[PDB]
Design a protein around this ligand. Structure first.
Ligand SMILES: Nc1ncnc2c1ncn2[C@@H]1O[C@H](COP(=O)(O)OP(=O)(O)O)[C@@H](O)[C@H]1O
Ligand SMILES: Nc1ncnc2c1ncn2[C@@H]1O[C@H](COP(=O)(O)OP(=O)(O)O)[C@@H](O)[C@H]1O
Ligand SMILES: Nc1ncnc2c1ncn2[C@@H]1O[C@H](COP(=O)(O)OP(=O)(O)O)[C@@H](O)[C@H]1O
Ligand SMILES: Nc1ncnc2c1ncn2[C@@H]1O[C@H](COP(=O)(O)OP(=O)(O)O)[C@@H](O)[C@H]1O
Lengths: 192, 195, 192, 189
C-alpha cells in the first residue's frame, strides 16, 4: 500500500414509506451518493454499471445528471425503465442491456458508479463476479471518478490499491443504529 | 397418499425482447397461468400472495381480473406499483404491504396464487425448505378459496403437494419445460384443474 | 322512507378543558360502540374504514375483536401502529394504507365502522368526501352490520334509507351535558 | 426597510411526512443549526407530532419540544422512541407564548400555525407572528422562522431590528418556489 485514505461516515436511518411503515431501504444512501457525485467537479454524466432495478439510476437522474444505465438482464432493464418513467426523469437516462465489461471500452462519461454482484474478509477479486479488479480496470478507461459500493468486510488494502500507487481513496462508512453496514469508496475528484 | 393427480405440460421458450436479445424470462409461464386462471369458473379476483416486483400480478390484471397484490417488502410494492402504472392496468390492482399470513383471514377472492420464497437437495420439502411453511401458506389460502395455484421447484415432493388437496382430493401438476428439461411445476387446485 | 327507526340515548362523560382525544368520536362513545358491537351476534372482526391515528381501532381491539384498520394517509397509519403498541393490542390489528372504497370489495369482516371525512341539515351525499351513500354501498358488500358515526344535524330520512325499503335503523343520540352532540346509527344485527 | 438581507437557495427532494416542513429541508435546517457556534439546545416551539423535533434530535442536539395539544405531544413521544432519540427530547404540553420567558436554549425553531397575494405574519398567523418572535428573542437571537413563499420580506426583515441581518433561504421543489426559511443571529450564512 502507498496512498492516502480518507475515512468518513454516513448514517442511514428509518424512513416513513408510502405504505405507512417505518422502514430501512437503499434509498437514503443512494440519495446521499447521488447528491455528492452531482456536486463534484465537472460531473454531469454517470454510468450506472450494474443498474439492477434502477434505485441508484433514479437518484442520479433526480439531481439533473444524465445516466447510462447498464444491466445484463433485460427483465431488470424493463423494470428500471418503468421505475424511471413514473419519476418523470426517463429522458435523462439511456438504458443499455448488456455486459458492462463489454460496453465499458466504448463509453464516455464523467463518473462510473459500481454496485456489482457481491467470510471474515471480502476479497473483491475472488468473491465478486465478475472480478472486482477487472470491473474497476474497465471503469478506468472511462474516467478516474469512480464510486464503489462494497460490503462492510471489504479488504481496504485491495480497495485502496485500485487508486494506484500512490493515489487517494475515501472510505465512506455506512452505519445503521451505530452498527457498520456497508462502505462507499470514492476515487478521483469524488473525494472531498 | 390418496386421491387423483393430473399431469400436464407447458413448454417455455425464448422470446425476442425489446433490447434485441433472444431470452428466457418468467413472462411466458406467468402469461400462461393468467390465461388458464382467468378462463376458470367464476374466477374474477385473485390474491397474488407474494407478488414481488409484480410479474404475475401484471399478467393477471392484463386478462381483466382484479388483483390483490401482497408483499411484506415495501420496496417490492413500490416497484410493482410503478410496473403496473406503465402497463395501464394499475386500477385493476390493490397493493397491500404486509405479511400474507396475517392478511389472509380478512380477504375475499376467487383465486389465490402462491409463489413463496424457496437447501440444494434431491427432494424439495415444502414444509421445511420454504419460509414461511408451505403447508401453513396453503392453509391460510384455503380460508379464502379452494382455487389455488402453487408455483414450485422441479424437485418438489409430489406426495406433499398432492396431500394439500386432502385425502380423496384432486391436484393437477403442470410441468414446465425449457428445451425438454424440466424447470418448475405449477400445481392447480379446485376449479382450476383441467377439464 | 318506509321501515322502522329506533331512537336511543347515550350520555357522554364530561371532559375537563384542554383534554383531547385521537378521534372526533369521543373515547367514551367509542368504548360504548365497541362494547355494543362486541356483544352482538357473531361479531368478531370489524373494519375501521377511516381509522386515522387509531382512536376507534383501539377501542374495538380492547374488547378482543380483530380489526382491519384502513386509512389512505401513510402518516396516520404509521402513527396508528405506534398507538396500537402503546395500548398493548397491536397483535389484534391489521393496518392497511389505502382507499376504503377500493379495498372494500376484497374484505371479509362481521362489522364495518364508518366515521368518514365531513349548515342546517347535513347531506351525507353532498357534505361527505367521499359520498356517504357510496361508502355505505361498499360497506354493504362486506356485511349488513354497519355503524355510522354522524353529525347531530344528519338527515334521518337519508340515514334511514340506507337500511333499504322496510329496513330497520337505530339512531343512538349522543349527549354531552344533556345537549345533543352527535349521532351513532346502527344497521343489521347491531340494532338493540 | 433597513440593514442586510442575504439570500440563499435549498432544493427539496402519495408519500407523506409528519410536518408541513418537508423531511429533507428539516434535515437541512437541523444540519446547519447544529453546525452553528455553540448551538446545542433547540426549542421546537410548535412541535406537532415531532417531525422537525426528530431531525434536530438526530444531529445530537437536545430539544425542548412544545405543543399546546396533548394529543400531539403523546404522538410525538411515540415517534421519538421509534427513531431512537427520545432521551434527546423534553416534551412540554403548553402554550409557547406562556412558556418562552422561562426557557434556556441556544436556538428557537418557529413554524407557527396559520389562522392572499402577500402573507402578513402579524394577521395571518395565530398567534401573532411578531409576538411569537418577541418571546423567542427573550430566549435567544438564533431563531429560524419557517414561512410561506409569499412572505413579506420587509416584514420578515424588520424582525432583525434596524440595521439587522437576516438570511432568506428559499426552498425550491423542482425549480419552483415552495416556502422560505428565515435565519437570524449566529445561524446566518
Ligand atoms: N456483467 C454484467 N454487466 C452488467 N450487469 C450485470 C453483470 N453481471 C450481473 N449484472 C447485473 O448486476 C446486478 C446485481 O447483481 P446481483 O447481486 O446478482 O443481483 P440481485 O440484486 O438480483 O441479487 C443484477 O441486476 C445483474 O443482472
Ligand atoms: N410473509 C410474506 N408475505 C408477503 N410477502 C412475502 C412474505 N415473505 C416474503 N415475502 C416476499 O415474497 C417474495 C419472496 O421472494 P424471495 O425469493 O424471498 O425474494 P427474491 O425474489 O428477492 O429472491 C419476496 O418479494 C418477499 O418480499
Ligand atoms: N378514501 C379514503 N379511504 C380511507 N381513508 C380516508 C379516505 N379519505 C380520507 N381518509 C382518512 O380518513 C380520515 C378522516 O378524514 P378527515 O376528517 O379529513 O380527517 P383529518 O382532518 O383528521 O385529517 C383521515 O385520517 C383521512 O386520511
Ligand atoms: N400557543 C401555542 N403554543 C404551542 N403550540 C401551539 C400553539 N398553538 C398551536 N400550537 C400547535 O401548533 C401546531 C401547528 O398548528 P396548526 O397549523 O393549527 O396545526 P395542524 O393543522 O397540524 O393541526 C399544532 O400542532 C398546534 O397544536
Amino acid at each position: 500500500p502507498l496512498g492516502s485514505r480518507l475515512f468518513s461516515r454516513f448514517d442511514d436511518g428509518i424512513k416513513l414509506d408510502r405504505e405507512g411503515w417505518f422502514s430501512v431501504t437503499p434509498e437514503k444512501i443512494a440519495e446521499h451518493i447521488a447528491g455528492r457525485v452531482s456536486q463534484s467537479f465537472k460531473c454531469d454524466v454517470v454510468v450506472d454499471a450494474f443498474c439492477g432495478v434502477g434505485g441508484n439510476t433514479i437518484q442520479f437522474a433526480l439531481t439533473g445528471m444524465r445516466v447510462i444505465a447498464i444491466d445484463i438482464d433485460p427483465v431488470k432493464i424493463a423494470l428500471a425503465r418503468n421505475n424511471a418513467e413514473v419519476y418523470g426523469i426517463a429522458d435523462k437516462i439511456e438504458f443499455i442491456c448488456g455486459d458492462f465489461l463489454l460496453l465499458a471500452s466504448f463509453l464516455k462519461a464523467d463518473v462510473v458508479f459500481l454496485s456489482p454482484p457481491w467470510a471474515e474478509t471480502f476479497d473483491i477479486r475472488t468473491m465478486m463476479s465478475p472480478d472486482g479488479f477487472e470491473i474497476f480496470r474497465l471503469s478506468k478507461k472511462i474516467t478516474n471518478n469512480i464510486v464503489y459500493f462494497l460490503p462492510r468486510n471489504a479488504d481496504i488494502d485491495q480497495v485502496a490499491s485500485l487508486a494506484g500507487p500512490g493515489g487517494q481513496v475515501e472510505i465512506e462508512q455506512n452505519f445503521l443504529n451505530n452498527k457498520l453496514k456497508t462502505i462507499t469508496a470514492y476515487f478521483g475528484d469524488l473525494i472531498r
